[PDB]
Symmetry: C3
Subunit: 313 residues, 3 copies
DNA sequence: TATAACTTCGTATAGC
DNA sequence: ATATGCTATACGAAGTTAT
DNA sequence: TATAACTTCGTATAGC
DNA sequence: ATATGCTATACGAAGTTAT
DNA sequence: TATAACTTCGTATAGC
DNA sequence: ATATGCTATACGAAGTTAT
């Protein structure tokens, strides 16, 4: 680690890449480094046949193609940055990444996706929570409403500041995102409750969402945001609420997570006949391929042909 | 052939590729081989300037760019498989495939597409056949209904087994495909007739469609399916029924073929304002590019701007 | 120039490329040539490190990535044509084009787009012009109608010949384009006025639009078309009409231009829930990516989620 | 004449 | 999220008629 | 104290 | 049908307050 | 027998 | 606007039953 760490420390501007990206670079580098160590190989610069065997090593441990792509990519970076040929540009490496994929496009392994939080889900949760006078519930129900209505990422929701909210037609809220997002009358109402009870509106620089301790005492803040982990947890808790704990099969997506609402909303708009430009606008997509992929798991069956044949649309 | 044949025979696992693919590999190889023979050239490994002249040869005979791409691709495979450089990776080859295309993107030659079997077509055929008490007609009308309603390929339709059928809302049938496909009330009814008269439901392992000999006697079966050729022929016959024989201009798509219903349905859904996700779901597409291309010949003119301007939508 | 010019003069068939393309080739070549001159460098064949410094030179002067891509592309052509390696295929060149882009995808510089002429705009213009008895106004209002209704490019509109017009359902006009474009009842009416007053229908080979001099006297013609510059000017004038002159900030798109109607119409159809195939048909697009990009600036906010949640669609 | 109302051009840049 | 190729518009300015 | 209700982390992997 | 790059979430677990 | 109504095939080419 | 890979249909013709 230290070695991995201190060696790096350079790339002049940390700011050259994202903190999220520097994080992954380190993990990979640490990973690659331990391996090279154990197997007595040269860490940097990296030899292709070694990179190739390192990926195979990842594959042989059960890692996704996407995870392997990651380790490869960060490795490619180091080299590229430090002005050296890219492991990727190595017949050996090219070849493995190809062998590894086929192996699974064949194998039937495909990228997963968060368990959808759809309208039926939202409705049910409201049936259970709308009446609650518990701060936590008032907060979380508003959070889910926004998540579902706006399709924003948890990192976007967490950074909403009270000053980002305005009103539009019919008094619905308007949330400005670095883009503007409109809430329905009902979601606006839930958010207004969270707002009146919480106190966040006391300082417009206050983040719309904040902690609520066991006291049930809220703690508005313009400097600290609820972690994305916390937001994930609201999803999970809510899941638990209606379905009880999860089995220990150890696999992802057994409960709702941070993308559940973005996934579900997308599916809801698609199943409802909504057009691609509108869908794109609802979630802020700019690529048709990216959005169509994101909705790769439409879960209802729309019977466009039945409708057409029955002339009943 | 034999030489072409027996030399191949290897690729350890036939199963490595599809039977349809091994078929094309052989044809090409036979083609390439005869040419090399006649022109005294080395068949394997293949020399680029020779591959290049072999493609030009295909072009100079009237073959489509897609057919040339095929011969090239199989040739590329052999080499790749047998661990050798890909003719494709040869300046000479790269260059021709480029020259050859331009030559036609210019030339105005474009990929064809099956003659569409659309709702108007389906309706007309029903006007003619619905009343028939002829087994053949009861069968074929049900086949066309499924083909149009579901947009399934002929190879998918041919492998439907009676046990793949269930019911849904309003008693409409549900056909499970390795995905589920819902039929409208009317198509379900046509299929039910075919089912009651044919006897296929006697053994649930029975393929939904089967032969009907000159006797008019059906022959249900769980081991043998109607060939895709036969299904193509139903399309053709039906075409002939309403338009009489085809001219001997010798060109493809003069009558309906196996894709006519998939093509037509797609066009019908597109002309009707149906959204891309729904269209995608109706035909089981996952790529937006692939579906938009497939509907490259929308044949009605939708006047979205006229509708918008006339505020009459 | 002369040197640039006369050296070129070859490419056997001028017809090998478009006149618009030969125009750009010359400009670039003239540009590149002057630079090479000033900086004492070899014009042809071109050395990569020189090409690289020439692009940097363009960047260092404020030119768009698209403009740089152009100079690069024409340069690549010359070489390619004259059977030489492509500057593009040069580590140095590859690298700059990459550095230059990042520099702006980062920089926030993005391709611009013409100021939209949308339905609200069309309506307003009609409020102002419909009553006019001025030839110029009768002409221009019809031109804008066609531009908006059909989404055709100015070079397509300019080449419409009176003989390209037919009628359809309800007596709406049908304009055949090398494709057929239908006008609404109202736009057809505006065009009919322009037609009756102008005299163009006297010779069916007459271009639908023609000059109208200060006399107010039209000059129908089957040999000369209104320049695309003129059409651009109608857009500008009309803009000026409702907003007065433009500031001298010197930037593009301060007033309506030739693409304003194609842009606006597209946005209008998108905001209205119209499907992608229909949108594609309205503007004659065949690529989903190309159309989605073209509508990268949807300007209204459709609230598909609000509609869905309010069950009010 | 003077001028509108164009056309022609050349560099810059969007869109298929 | 993405590069590279050909063809189109953007627009100020200079040249052209028929007034 | 114990604890809820967080935050911080690190490996794994989805999505723009 | 498709590769490769950067940035985001997924989630168990270990650390942190204010009860 | 003759024949319909298939199946099998092989080259050509569309579609995922 | 775009190349390249694998798998499917297109269709005339020759072979196969059960009439």
């Amino acid at each position: 680690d230290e070695v991995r760490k201190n060696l790096m420390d350079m790339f002049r501007d940390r700011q050259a890449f994202s903190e999220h990206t520097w994080k992954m670079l380190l993990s990979v580098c640490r990973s690659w480094a331990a391996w090279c160590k154990l197997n007595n190989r040269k860490w940097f610069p990296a030899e292709p046949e070694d990179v190739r065997d390192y990926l195979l090593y990842l594959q042989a441990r059960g890692l996704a193609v996407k995870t392997i792509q990651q380790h490869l990519g960060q490795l490619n970076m180091l080299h590229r940055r430090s002005g050296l040929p890219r492991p990727s540009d190595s017949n050996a490496v090219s070849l493995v990444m190809r062998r590894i994929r086929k192996e699974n496009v064949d194998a039937g392994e495909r990228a997963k996706q968060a368990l959808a939080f759809e309208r039926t889900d939202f409705d049910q949760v409201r049936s259970l929570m709308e009446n609650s006078d518990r701060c936590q519930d008032i907060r979380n129900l508003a959070f889910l409403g926004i998540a579902y209505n706006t399709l924003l990422r948890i990192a976007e929701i967490a950074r909403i500041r009270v000053k980002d909210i305005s009103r539009t037609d019919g008094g619905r809220m308007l949330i400005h995102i670095g883009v503007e997002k409109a809430l329905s009358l009902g979601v606006t109402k839930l958010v207004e409750r969270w707002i009146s009870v919480s106190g966040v509106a006391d300082d417009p620089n206050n983040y719309l969402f904040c902690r609520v301790r066991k006291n049930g005492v809220a703690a508005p803040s313009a400097t600290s945001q609820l972690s994305t982990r916390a937001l994930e947890g609201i999803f999970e808790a809510t899941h638990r609420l209606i379905y009880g704990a999860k089995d220990d099969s150890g696999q992802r997506y057994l409960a709702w997570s941070g993308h559940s609402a973005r996934v579900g909303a997308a599916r809801d708009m698609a199943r409802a006949g909504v057009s691609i430009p509108e869908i794109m606008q609802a979630g802020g997509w700019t690529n048709v391929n990216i959005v169509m992929n994101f909705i790769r798991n439409l879960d209802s069956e729309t019977g466009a042909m039945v409708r057409l044949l029955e002339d009943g649309d």
